[PDB]
């Protein structure tokens, strides 16, 4: 079950046997991140590091005290020494609390990993804050998505994704403080 002892350090030593000796080793994405998963530490009691990302932005990388994540089973919350978790998220609201103050991003879906060292790594695609969403045109397209269901089995899923996104978006503009 351990046929290939791979890794970044192993690739350097074997690549000096097949490539020319002029070329130095290519870099690897492990050489650019300092935070690991199994590396012990990185909790520091109350506030744990939350890396809330998008493809186009780094929306948070400082530490928070709790993260309300919109998992596909339901909304769960993460405290500091949470269990290791690979959580696929629904379209829902990621709530980043620091204490008394909390910032509420509505995300489109996309995973969230809690690593064994207590590092939370939320990984979504479009993460809009609810301040820049308007509650008018959400049901203007949801009423259209509640009407147009043909026998296209590819649009079977794409309309299902259209309905469940706006429906969670309907319910998460109503309860704002």
């Amino acid at each position: 079950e351990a046929a290939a002892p791979a890794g970044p350090k192993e690739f350097t030593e074997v690549w000096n046997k097949k490539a020319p000796s002029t070329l130095i080793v290519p870099e690897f994405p492990s050489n650019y991140t300092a935070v690991k998963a199994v590396g012990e530490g990185q909790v520091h009691g109350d506030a744990f590091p939350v890396n809330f990302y998008t493809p186009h932005s780094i929306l948070s990388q400082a530490q928070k005290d709790t993260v309300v994540l919109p998992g596909v089973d339901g909304y769960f919350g993460v405290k500091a020494s949470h269990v290791p978790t690979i959580a696929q998220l629904k379209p829902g609201v990621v709530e980043l609390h620091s204490g008394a103050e909390s910032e509420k991003f509505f995300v489109s879906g996309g995973f969230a990993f809690v690593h064994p060292n207590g590092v939370t790594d939320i990984c979504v695609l479009e993460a809009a804050t609810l301040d820049q969403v308007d509650p008018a045109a959400v049901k203007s397209a949801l009423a259209a998505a509640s009407a147009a269901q043909p026998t296209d089995e590819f649009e079977q899923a794409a309309n299902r994704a259209a309905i469940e996104l706006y429906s969670a978006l309907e319910s998460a503009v109503e309860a704002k403080a």
């Binding site: 690979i86 696929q88 990984c123």
Partner: peptide
């Protein structure tokens, strides 16, 4: 070590997760 919170199996979420790792 990780507790999978997906809809379907771990072998099925990793199918979703490496395409997303490919596109990223």
């Amino acid at each position: 070590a990780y507790d999978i919170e997906a809809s379907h199996e771990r072998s099925d979420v990793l199918r979703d997760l490496t395409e997303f790792h490919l596109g990223v």
